[PDB]
């Protein structure tokens, strides 16, 4: 019981098969488990690199509203974030999308438009003539 | 690091973690793309506009103008719109499922007529304390949309006799029932409606005038789960015995405030009751004698409720405190016949009990209110 | 003393915040807590203890009148009443009663 | 995107020819779908549907008009291969299933299914074709060895039955509530019952004109037991009641008039073992013991 997952740029990551058993690798072994194994060949992941795959197995190892461990684990750069979102969507880790999409929503929540726009470097693709009609359309608080 | 490079599925999953106020007030002014994301059938098929007072009067024209799949309208505690403002939305109502409007007094039977004929699909009609809701509209509600599966008609003193029979002959898919102090409810409307659908699980007839002549015939069905027969008119004891002996599947039994009901029922309820989970006996005239049987002869129990008991045995309560393994639900209130040892020792002896005494639940409530 | 607790709860009640159980009389909403009305009126513990919901909505029969009703909660809280001779009869029970009230 | 679709089709075509390639490829095909979808997949769904339709159309020019006991081998083998490969393809297209199809149906909208249900519908239109009448006729002819035969190859029949149960209406009405035996009933069970009725009518008439009534009851009981057991090796649970009612109405309830006379003759010369058999046979009927109860 050891999948030999290889990262995008190339680094072999042996895991026990309950640690990396998520609905796109769990499903693969269910539909390709009838025949003989391929001598424990590496299963490359072309959309997950070797610095993000390290954290994905760190999060799945422990778990064999945003608790304390998940608050201190998700204390990475915004660039190290936004790729844990994509690497949990790619491999379909249903419990890592939840605790990560709350965090990105926890810095949108209760911060007014201006510093929300500043936090995520959003360029204001918004004029002022049509701002008077969008603030009157949501008048009902 | 660009957040807008994320696929729209991820952005919608992020935006679903914001309230409607946050989504329509802050995240809709950041840019064009966020405003277009925070406007979907995803976010506008579960309305829940309860207690929005004098802000939604004619606005209901825009919430359902291009929206096609409203299924969770909830305008409870409304005080602003009128019959016109609800019938305009009722005209379309594509596949509405769970219409709910409690305590909306200004609404009348016209809203019921509008909502009952323009959607042949429904699942929940939980209306509330709306007065002047006469029975003429519920007739057509049962005649046209015979797909409804759950009603709630408390505190509507105009549903005397025609309503139950009319949504009892046509409709058959009902699962739950709830009624309140509604007078002029005759017995000759439920006896006929007791053989068609035996799949009912929740039954509630508090403060109603249902005679036991229909309760006696309840032995037919053997799939009932929950009972709420509070303040009922002398239900048969042997019927309760038969339904508790045969129907092993039984979840709840309240039977509170009943005075002709005697001590025999609770004496015998511990003889064979193993799956019973809670008991609500408030102001019962128990003769402090069934405690020994309920402690010795009962091993599976986790919820116990002692009400306005004038007399009690402190020794027996202490014995049953350690007799069980997980029965820690002593919500004592106004128990004058109590000592000062249990409330002083069992608080620290068992750190897994919350208790309900006045001396304790005054600092705890303030502390939990201050923290949250 | 616990009367300090009662007075603090009373002042918190008289802000329309931290109120748990809501009483409805022909439209008037009178907010209060969960434990105290359970301790006061035996008609209320009946409708309360059977639920663990968030926000509660208990309605009272026409038999109970508002005019006597406001001082009922006051006497539940601080055990002090104000009353004159014109509005007495619908309260003359001296064991509260007034509700159902066969004890 | 044709840059994706060339290799995607080249991999799907070898998913269906069960060559059993490694996991480094069946994770490289999932990446094609993921990369395409996150670049929606309406035309991807169209290409998959067209591929499945053409695959079945070309597959089914073989194995046709090879009628008896040879449509069975064809149908069973091709059905199991198709079902396994379609489960694998659904596993590959899980992303399109989870995000586009789910968001697209979301109301009961018809014409758009998951990949497994899409393949099941396409194979049902493979059944909605001459390969559902000669497989059924050959199943009936193979069961029509009720007289004699031991190398009947039960696996040829039962598998066919399984197919007719899997092809129950998959078209997202609201949700799969329970058993969905509509195609099963309509395409097999009516003919099965109407054939067993004729077989047992002819057999009963022939045997009664060939032998007396005393040991016809033995045969009737044995045949009832045989029909009861046959529903457990060609197993579907909901046929036993109807088949039993057919068999009781044909074997008994049609020769009661001679049962009464044989009852009187058995009473005259006391054969107490035949009367028990008669009592059981006539008690299987509803309201049939009336004349026996008076003759006694």
Swiss-Prot record, chain A:
GO BP annotations, alphabetical order: chromatin remodeling; maintenance of protein location in nucleus; positive regulation of ubiquitin protein ligase activity; proteasome-mediated ubiquitin-dependent protein catabolic process; protein K48-linked ubiquitination; protein monoubiquitination; protein polyubiquitination; protein ubiquitination
Keyword Ubl conjugation: yes
Modified-residue entries (Phosphothreonine), positions: 112
Record's keyword annotation contains Ubl conjugation: yes
Site of covalent link Glycyl lysine isopeptide (Lys-Gly) (interchain with G-Cter in SUMO1): 123
Single GO molecular function: protein domain specific binding
Modification after translation (UniProt): Undergoes autophagy-mediated degradation in the liver in a time-dependent manner.
CDD domains: BTB_POZ_SKP1
Subunit (UniProt): Interacts with KDM2B, forming heterodimers. The KDM2B-SKP1 heterodimeric complex interacts with the PCGF1-BCORL heterodimeric complex to form a homotetrameric polycomb repression complex 1 (PRC1.1). Component of multiple SCF (SKP1-CUL1-F-box) E3 ubiquitin-protein ligase complexes formed of CUL1, SKP1, RBX1 and a variable F-box domain-containing protein as substrate-specific subunit. Component of the SCF(FBXW11) complex containing FBXW11. Component of the SCF(SKP2) complex containing SKP2, in which it interacts directly with SKP1, SKP2 and RBX1.
PANTHER family (alphabetical): SKP1
Protein family (similarity comment): Belongs to the SKP1 family.
Protein's name in the database: S-phase kinase-associated protein 1
Originating organism: Homo sapiens
From Swiss-Prot, chain B:
Record annotation: effect of changing residue 309 to R: Impaired ability to bind substrate proteins
Primary localization: cytoplasm
Domain (F-box) ranges: 1-47
Quaternary assembly: Part of the SCF (SKP1-CUL1-F-box) E3 ubiquitin-protein ligase complex SCF(FBXL17) composed of CUL1, SKP1, RBX1 and FBXL17. Interacts with BTB domain-containing proteins such as KLHL12, BCL6 and BACH1; specifically recognizes and binds a conserved degron of non-consecutive residues present at the interface of BTB dimers of aberrant composition. Interacts with SUFU. Interacts with PRMT1.
Keywords: Cytoplasm, Neurogenesis, Nucleus, Ubl conjugation pathway
GO CC term (a single one): nucleus
Protein name per its UniProtKB record: F-box/LRR-repeat protein 17
Spans through the membrane: none
Residues of the full protein shown: 319 to 690 of 701
Organism: Homo sapiens
UniProtKB/Swiss-Prot annotation, chain C:
PTM characteristics: Ubiquitinated by the SCF(FBXL17) complex or by the by the SCF(FBXO22) complex, leading to its degradation by the proteasome. Under oxidative stress, reactive oxygen species covalently modify cysteine residues on the bZIP domain of BACH1 and release it from chromatin. If the BTB domain of BACH1 remains intact, its beta1-alpha6 degron is recognized by FBXO22, promoting its ubiquitination and degradation.
Subcellular location: Nucleus
Domain (BTB): residue spans on this chain: 19-85
Subunit organization: Heterodimer of BACH1 and MAFK.
Protein family (similarity comment): Belongs to the bZIP family. CNC subfamily.
Protein purpose: Transcriptional regulator that acts as a repressor or activator, depending on the context. Binds to NF-E2 DNA binding sites. Plays important roles in coordinating transcription activation and repression by MAFK. Together with MAF, represses the transcription of genes under the control of the NFE2L2 oxidative stress pathway.
Name recorded for this polypeptide: Transcription regulator protein BACH1
UniProt source species: Homo sapiens
Swiss-Prot record, chain D:
Top-level taxon of the source organism: Eukaryota
Tissue occurrence: Expressed in lung fibroblasts.
Free-text description of this protein's post-translational modifications in UniProt: Neddylated; which enhances the ubiquitination activity of SCF. Neddylation prevents binding of the inhibitor CAND1. Neddylation leads to structural rearrangment in the complex that allows interaction between the E2 ubiquitin-conjugating enzyme and the acceptor ubiquitin. Deneddylated via its interaction with the COP9 signalosome (CSN) complex. (Microbial infection) Deneddylated by Epstein-Barr virus BPLF1 leading to a S-phase-like environment that is required for efficient replication of the viral genome.
Role according to the record: Core component of multiple cullin-RING-based SCF (SKP1-CUL1-F-box protein) E3 ubiquitin-protein ligase complexes, which mediate the ubiquitination of proteins involved in cell cycle progression, signal transduction and transcription. SCF complexes and ARIH1 collaborate in tandem to mediate ubiquitination of target proteins. In the SCF complex, serves as a rigid scaffold that organizes the SKP1-F-box protein and RBX1 subunits. May contribute to catalysis through positioning of the substrate and the ubiquitin-conjugating enzyme.
Domain free text: The Cullin neddylation domain restrains the RING domain of RBX1 in the E3 ubiquitin-protein ligase complex; this restraint is removed upon neddylation of the cullin.
This protein's encoding gene: CUL1
């Amino acid at each position: 019981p050891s999948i030999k997952l290889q990262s995008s740029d190339g680094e072999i990551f042996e895991v026990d098969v309950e640690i990396a058993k998520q609905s796109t690798i769990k499903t693969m072994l269910e539909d390709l488990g009838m025949d003989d194994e391929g001598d424990d060949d590496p299963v490359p992941l072309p959309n997950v690199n070797a610095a993000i795959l390290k954290k994905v197995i760190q999060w799945c190892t422990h778990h064999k509203d945003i608790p304390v461990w998940d608050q201190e684990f998700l204390k990475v750069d915004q660039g190290t974030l936004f790729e844990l979102i994509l690497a949990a969507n790619y491999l379909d880790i249903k419990g890592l999308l939840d605790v990560t999409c709350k965090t990105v929503a926890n810095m949108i929540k209760g911060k007014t438009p201006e510093e929300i726009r500043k936090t995520f470097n959003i360029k204001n693709d918004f004029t002022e003539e049509e701002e008077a009609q969008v603030r009157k359309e949501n008048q009902w608080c | 690091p660009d957040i807008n490079q994320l696929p729209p599925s991820i952005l919608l999953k992020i935006f679903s973690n914001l309230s409607l106020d946050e989504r329509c007030l802050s995240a809709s002014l950041v840019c064009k793309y966020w405003r277009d994301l925070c406007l979907d059938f995803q976010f506008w098929k579960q309305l829940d506009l309860s207690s929005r007072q004098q802000v939604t009067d004619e606005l209901l024209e825009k919430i359902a103008s291009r929206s096609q799949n409203i299924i969770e309208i909830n305008i409870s505690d409304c005080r602003s719109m009128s019959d016109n403002g609800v019938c305009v939305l009722a005209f379309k109502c594509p596949g509405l499922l769970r219409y709910t409007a409690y305590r909306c007094k200004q609404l009348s039977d016209t809203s019921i007529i509008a909502v009952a004929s323009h959607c042949p699909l429904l699942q929940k009609v939980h209306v509330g304390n709306q007065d002047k809701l006469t029975d003429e509209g519920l007739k057509q509600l049962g005649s046209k949309c015979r797909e409804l599966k759950d009603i709630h008609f408390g505190q509507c003193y105009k549903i005397s006799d025609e309503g139950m029979i009319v949504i009892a002959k046509g409709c058959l898919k009902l699962q739950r029932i709830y009624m309140q102090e509604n007078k002029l409810v005759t017995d000759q409307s439920v006896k006929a409606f007791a053989e068609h659908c035996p799949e009912l699980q929740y039954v509630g007839f508090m403060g109603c005038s249902v005679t036991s002549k229909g309760v006696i015939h309840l032995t037919k069905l053997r799939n009932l789960s929950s009972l709420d027969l509070r303040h009922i008119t002398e239900l048969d004891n042997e019927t309760v015995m038969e339904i508790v002996k045969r129907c092993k599947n039984l979840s709840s039994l309240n039977l509170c405030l009943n005075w002709i009901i005697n001590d025999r029922c609770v004496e015998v309820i511990a003889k064979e009751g193993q799956n019973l989970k809670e008991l609500y006996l408030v102001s019962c005239k128990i003769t402090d004698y069934a405690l020994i049987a309920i402690g010795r002869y009962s091993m599976t129990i986790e919820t116990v409720d002692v009400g306005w008991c004038k007399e009690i045995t402190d020794q027996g309560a202490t014995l049953i405190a350690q007799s069980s393994k997980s029965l820690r639900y002593l919500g004592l209130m106004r128990c004058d016949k109590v000592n000062e040892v249990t409330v002083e020792q069992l608080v620290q002896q068992y750190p897994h009990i919350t208790f309900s005494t006045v001396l304790q639940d005054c600092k705890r409530t303030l502390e939990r209110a201050y923290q949250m | 003393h616990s009367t300090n607790v009662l007075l603090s709860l009373n002042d918190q009640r008289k802000k329309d915040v931290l109120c748990d159980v809501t009483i409805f009389v022909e439209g008037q909403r009178f907010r209060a807590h969960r434990s105290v009305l359970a301790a006061c009126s035996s008609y209320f513990h009946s409708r309360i203890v059977g639920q663990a919901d968030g926000e509660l909505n208990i309605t009272l029969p026409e038999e109970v009148t508002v005019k006597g009703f406001e001082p009922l909660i006051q006497f539940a809280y601080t055990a002090k009443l104000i009353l004159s001779k014109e509005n007495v009869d619908e309260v003359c029970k001296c064991v509260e009663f007034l509700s159902v009230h066969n004890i | 995107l044709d840059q994706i679709w060339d290799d995607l089709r080249a991999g799907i075509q070898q998913v269906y020819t069960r060559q059993s390639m490694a996991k480094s490829r069946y994770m490289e095909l999932y990446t094609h779908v993921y990369n395409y979808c996150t670049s929606v997949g309406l035309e991807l769904y169209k290409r998959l549907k067209e591929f499945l339709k053409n695959y079945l159309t070309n597959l089914l020019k073989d194995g046709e008009d090879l009628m008896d006991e040879s449509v069975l081998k064809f149908y069973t083998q091709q059905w199991e291969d198709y079902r396994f490969s379609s489960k694998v393809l659904n596993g590959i297209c899980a992303y399109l299933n989870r995000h586009w199809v789910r968001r697209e149906c979301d109301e009961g909208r018809k014409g758009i299914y998951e990949i497994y249900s899409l393949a099941l519908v396409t194979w049902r239109d493979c059944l909605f074709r001459p390969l559902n009448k000669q497989v059924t006729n050959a199943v009936l002819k193979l069961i029509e060895k009720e007289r004699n035969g031991e190398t009947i190859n039960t696996r040829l029949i039962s598998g066919v039955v399984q197919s007719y149960v899997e092809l129950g209406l998959n078209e997202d009405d609201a949700f799969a509530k329970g058993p969905t035996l509509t195609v099963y009933k309509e395409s097999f069970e009516s003919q099965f019952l109407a054939d067993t009725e004729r077989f047992y009518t002819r057999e009963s008439t022939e045997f009664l004109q060939q032998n007396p009534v005393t040991e016809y009851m033995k045969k009737a009981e044995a045949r009832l037991l045989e029909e009861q057991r046959r529903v457990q090796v060609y197993l579907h649970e909901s046929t036993q009641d109807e088949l039993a009612r057919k068999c009781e109405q044909v074997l008994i309830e049609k020769h009661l008039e001679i049962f009464h006379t044989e009852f009187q003759n058995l009473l005259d010369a006391d054969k107490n073992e035949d009367l028990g058999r008669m009592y059981n046979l006539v008690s299987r009927i509803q309201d049939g013991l009336g004349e026996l109860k008076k003759l006694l």
